[PDB]
Design an enzyme around this catalytic site. Sequence first.
Site, PDB file in Angstrom:
ATOM      1  N   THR B 259      -3.601  13.844  22.373  1.00 43.64           N
ATOM      2  CA  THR B 259      -4.618  14.889  22.369  1.00 43.64           C
ATOM      3  C   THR B 259      -5.724  14.549  21.383  1.00 43.64           C
ATOM      4  O   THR B 259      -6.913  14.660  21.706  1.00 43.64           O
ATOM      5  CB  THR B 259      -3.999  16.247  22.014  1.00 43.64           C
ATOM      6  OG1 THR B 259      -3.368  16.170  20.728  1.00 43.64           O
ATOM      7  CG2 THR B 259      -2.970  16.673  23.052  1.00 43.64           C
ATOM      8  N   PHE B 384      -6.994  25.002  21.684  1.00 45.95           N
ATOM      9  CA  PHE B 384      -5.749  24.926  20.930  1.00 45.95           C
ATOM     10  C   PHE B 384      -4.774  26.046  21.289  1.00 45.95           C
ATOM     11  O   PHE B 384      -3.882  26.364  20.498  1.00 45.95           O
ATOM     12  CB  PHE B 384      -6.035  24.930  19.427  1.00 45.95           C
ATOM     13  CG  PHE B 384      -6.757  23.701  18.949  1.00 45.95           C
ATOM     14  CD1 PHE B 384      -6.080  22.503  18.806  1.00 45.95           C
ATOM     15  CD2 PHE B 384      -8.105  23.746  18.640  1.00 45.95           C
ATOM     16  CE1 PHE B 384      -6.736  21.364  18.367  1.00 45.95           C
ATOM     17  CE2 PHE B 384      -8.768  22.613  18.199  1.00 45.95           C
ATOM     18  CZ  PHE B 384      -8.081  21.422  18.061  1.00 45.95           C
ATOM     19  N   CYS B 391      -1.836  26.066  18.734  1.00 49.13           N
ATOM     20  CA  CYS B 391      -1.543  24.759  18.162  1.00 49.13           C
ATOM     21  C   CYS B 391      -1.370  24.855  16.653  1.00 49.13           C
ATOM     22  O   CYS B 391      -2.309  25.205  15.931  1.00 49.13           O
ATOM     23  CB  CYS B 391      -2.665  23.773  18.496  1.00 49.13           C
ATOM     24  SG  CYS B 391      -2.519  22.187  17.618  1.00 49.13           S
TER      25      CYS B 391
HETATM   26  C1  HEM Z   1      -7.266  17.710  19.580  1.00 54.82           C
HETATM   27  C2  HEM Z   1      -5.945  17.673  19.371  1.00 54.82           C
HETATM   28  C3  HEM Z   1      -4.958  18.749  19.889  1.00 54.82           C
HETATM   29  C4  HEM Z   1      -5.092  19.614  20.911  1.00 54.82           C
HETATM   30  C5  HEM Z   1      -6.275  19.777  21.898  1.00 54.82           C
HETATM   31  C6  HEM Z   1      -3.886  20.411  20.978  1.00 54.82           C
HETATM   32  C7  HEM Z   1      -3.633  21.409  21.893  1.00 54.82           C
HETATM   33  C8  HEM Z   1      -2.568  22.279  21.876  1.00 54.82           C
HETATM   34  C9  HEM Z   1      -2.370  23.407  22.763  1.00 54.82           C
HETATM   35  C10 HEM Z   1      -3.324  23.849  23.895  1.00 54.82           C
HETATM   36  C11 HEM Z   1      -1.219  24.000  22.428  1.00 54.82           C
HETATM   37  C12 HEM Z   1      -0.607  25.241  23.106  1.00 54.82           C
HETATM   38  C13 HEM Z   1       0.226  24.748  24.286  1.00 54.82           C
HETATM   39  C14 HEM Z   1       0.916  25.894  24.976  1.00 54.82           C
HETATM   40  O1  HEM Z   1       0.472  27.057  24.810  1.00 54.82           O
HETATM   41  O2  HEM Z   1       1.911  25.642  25.705  1.00 54.82           O
HETATM   42  C15 HEM Z   1      -0.644  23.269  21.317  1.00 54.82           C
HETATM   43  C16 HEM Z   1       0.540  23.558  20.678  1.00 54.82           C
HETATM   44  C17 HEM Z   1       1.123  22.789  19.696  1.00 54.82           C
HETATM   45  N1  HEM Z   1       0.577  21.664  19.104  1.00 54.82           N
HETATM   46 FE1  HEM Z   1      -1.259  20.881  19.450  1.00 54.82          FE
HETATM   47  N2  HEM Z   1      -3.040  20.000  19.968  1.00 54.82           N
HETATM   48  C18 HEM Z   1      -3.667  18.986  19.275  1.00 54.82           C
HETATM   49  C19 HEM Z   1      -3.152  18.315  18.187  1.00 54.82           C
HETATM   50  C20 HEM Z   1      -1.914  18.526  17.619  1.00 54.82           C
HETATM   51  C21 HEM Z   1      -1.385  17.865  16.440  1.00 54.82           C
HETATM   52  C22 HEM Z   1      -2.165  16.793  15.641  1.00 54.82           C
HETATM   53  C23 HEM Z   1      -0.147  18.350  16.215  1.00 54.82           C
HETATM   54  C24 HEM Z   1       0.871  17.997  15.101  1.00 54.82           C
HETATM   55  C25 HEM Z   1       0.583  17.302  13.995  1.00 54.82           C
HETATM   56  C26 HEM Z   1       0.134  19.335  17.245  1.00 54.82           C
HETATM   57  C27 HEM Z   1       1.297  20.070  17.377  1.00 54.82           C
HETATM   58  C28 HEM Z   1       1.479  21.184  18.174  1.00 54.82           C
HETATM   59  C29 HEM Z   1       2.637  22.061  18.192  1.00 54.82           C
HETATM   60  C30 HEM Z   1       3.899  21.905  17.314  1.00 54.82           C
HETATM   61  C31 HEM Z   1       2.424  23.020  19.102  1.00 54.82           C
HETATM   62  C32 HEM Z   1       3.372  24.185  19.470  1.00 54.82           C
HETATM   63  C33 HEM Z   1       3.151  25.332  18.482  1.00 54.82           C
HETATM   64  C34 HEM Z   1       4.133  26.455  18.712  1.00 54.82           C
HETATM   65  O3  HEM Z   1       4.282  26.895  19.881  1.00 54.82           O
HETATM   66  O4  HEM Z   1       4.755  26.923  17.721  1.00 54.82           O
HETATM   67  N3  HEM Z   1      -0.966  19.412  18.079  1.00 54.82           N
HETATM   68  N4  HEM Z   1      -1.491  22.222  21.010  1.00 54.82           N
END
Ligand code: HEM
EC number: 1.14.14.1
Lengths: 450, 446
Positions: B259, B384, B391
Amino acid sequence: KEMPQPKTFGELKNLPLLNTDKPVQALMKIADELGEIFKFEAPGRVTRYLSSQRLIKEACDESRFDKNLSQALKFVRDFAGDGLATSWTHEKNWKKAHNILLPSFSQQAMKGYHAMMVDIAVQLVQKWERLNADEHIEVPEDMTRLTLDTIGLCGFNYRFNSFYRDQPHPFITSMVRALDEAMNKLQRDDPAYDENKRQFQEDIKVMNDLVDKIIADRKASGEQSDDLLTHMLNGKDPETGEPLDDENIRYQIITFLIAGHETTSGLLSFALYFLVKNPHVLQKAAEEAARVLVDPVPSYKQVKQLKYVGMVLNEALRLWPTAPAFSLYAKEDTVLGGEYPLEKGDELMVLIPQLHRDKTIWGDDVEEFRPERFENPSAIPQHAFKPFGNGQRACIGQQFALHEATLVLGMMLKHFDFEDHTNYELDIKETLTLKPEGFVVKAKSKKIPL
Amino acid sequence: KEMPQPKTFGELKNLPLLNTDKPVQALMKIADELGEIFKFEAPGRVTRYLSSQRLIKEACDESRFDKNLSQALKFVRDFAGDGLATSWTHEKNWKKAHNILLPSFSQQAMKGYHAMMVDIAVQLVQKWERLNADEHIEVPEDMTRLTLDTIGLCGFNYRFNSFYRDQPHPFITSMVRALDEAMNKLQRYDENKRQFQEDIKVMNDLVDKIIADRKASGEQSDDLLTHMLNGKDPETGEPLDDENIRYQIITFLIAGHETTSGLLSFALYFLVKNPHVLQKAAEEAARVLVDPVPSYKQVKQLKYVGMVLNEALRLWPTAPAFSLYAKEDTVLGGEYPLEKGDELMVLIPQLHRDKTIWGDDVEEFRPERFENPSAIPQHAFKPFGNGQRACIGQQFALHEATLVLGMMLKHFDFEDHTNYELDIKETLTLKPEGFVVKAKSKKIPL
Ligand code: HEM
Ligand code: HEM
């Protein structure tokens, strides 16, 4: 290690710095100059003002610090008694009243107060609907009319009927004058103050007489309302097994009026000030109000759906927390921040407006009004946002204040467009609390029926 | 009242529409045809794709909708376990890990990760400084090297050393192949199954070994692993167990690396396609990054670079969808009745092209759109995710991307030497496949 201190006045030390009509704002300017902690000395008094999240999160450690009655709270205690806000944690009546009253202030308990809150909110909306062309609104005055009547109705089913009056109900005049005398005592006893003393005792008798009469009236009838008074007349502390006696119930009712009316009306006034100064925020908040409040009378569940309105209120509380400080004492010898050793009994003051401007937590834009900061509550660090105090001594009326403020602001945004017709210049008056003095607006009705 | 639906294939309903190598872009084209909501039916599956801010702002009401595990997330769960991204909100391990990990992902926590991010960013800059004349850069490939090494270092103090390799670290080979297999099942084998189980064992073995090594060492680092080994959930009072910690580290690598590298790749693509925007961002980089090594505070001052990243996330959000389910019976948009449990998909790239929000120039790259967050309507911009299931790595990704893009703009001028034609490859994420540039060094020392 060495602690900064503002300028002194010979034998009076720092005390004359409080001889000003804006002492909180003066203390904020001192914190800007001296940093996260400075000592404040007076004849027979030493305290320390904290401004950084780093040190305040330690002061909020309940194993190390307990709530202290500031000199202001000690003076208020002369009519608030051992009510919740002016009692020590170790006093039997604090934990007793706390256990009894906590369920009556829960989020679930707001369902029972909602109808009474709507009653007063509709009176506010009707007042503004009935204004003539080019007439304006005195915002803090009307917000104070609302919050005071709402706590009177929800507190003990009494109608101050502030929207029928120019001069307030005699109880309110005495309460306001009692609070003024308590606060004036801080920056102050020669024989000339004998007139202040006689008036102070007269105002105390006014408050006790009305509240004691209402308690006695309610006990003689046996009537059951949806108010806090009924809850206190029937509640028993699970720990001691005891109910509150009639004297403490009176002090609690007086406390709800003091602790609740002016903080909440200031929040509403500051919120409307920030909304009319930030038209993009106002549009966003008004859109939500129009989309969510689809009925002539808002429901409890609809108020909970006003997420952005709630974000507006939190950001207003960040910039100008209307109860701007609270006091703590060290339970034992301890070291603050690894460089400031404190002895048992040493006092600390938490300067909430400064905490809420800590750039190490909030970034460089601390002075800008952006409700989007609170879009996701989890992004807020521990003890960075403390408009309602700390721990078991936090504000018991937090859910009450936020529900009332969300309901009323939502209805205001639903029913009117607002104009800052004077380009109002923020001037913050300081009493026991903070408010934007002279804040005025024009309301143009959206002609939506109630 | 009646909900549109794309073309059907007899008993298979809409399912063959997903048998394509660009399914997200295919769903965007369907939304262009059918509008803000359409039904998507398959054998034993019904979901609804939302594309308008009008309806998505309702879907983001956490009192009415909760996060759903899409079929894709369910397949990823086979190796991401009950990590944060593939766990249900009602699972004990979600709220537990959420409470524990939230402080280590805060904006204030980025101050502690900054030095490790600079470490990898300097390796990227030095690689490009050491290229010979008329050599070029493979942008998504190098961005993935950077983001993957950055999460390895900040996550558990492990150096994948991607800038020393042509063939990635064996863990990455298994992770990429596991993600490919999960996505192929959506549009779908005994060899695939045996290979899928082989890659899961590779990922578990390395991560479990690093955990044991850290516990057997007792050393304290500035990484997420240290925080998870010592942290306790304030609510339950319990720490994460070693198995769930494994799923979290695997999750950070999956959820974070591609991502973020896609965001960097799309951002550079849009900059070289919009020379006036690139000049504006490069001017800010030169004015702010006055030291050989950027500081944390300097990255926070790269305001326009951050707007560039947000506008890149608007056009091509690299996590292009998320799923929701109705907590109770409810009515969407006043005309679409939903029953408890009914599923919704949020098509983020289409949401970000809602002309009623952004104007008619929705396809133009203009970072100035994000000058004031208060002027952006509620729930119009969701790269996010939403609410408590948003996120958790948002500040991490934006800090890394702002730091690296800022250093790239300070140290090099960029040339679109092939006049690259945008071609978006679809995996779990989106990236501009084959995007290449030439960098001419400004000869500014590190
Ligand atoms: C531009 C970069 C990123 C984008 C666009 C992005 C996007 C997203 C999105 C849309 C979700 C929600 C997904 C859902 O609702 O099913 C999410 C959840 C999550 N992301 Fe990211 N992400 C990015 C970078 C990262 C990074 C760098 C990390 C960790 C170091 C990360 C860890 C997580 C985690 C652990 C979740 C789940 C949170 C939870 O439900 O408790 N993401 N991300
Ligand atoms: C926006 C409005 C309000 C704000 C900002 C506010 C703020 C505060 C703060 C900071 C404290 C702690 C003071 C200390 O530690 O010395 C407190 C305590 C208290 N407040 Fe509020 N308050 C508000 C509204 C209300 C309302 C509406 C009520 C009653 C209906 C209320 C009743 C109390 C009581 C009883 C306490 C003492 C609690 C205890 O120590 O057990 N407040 N408030």
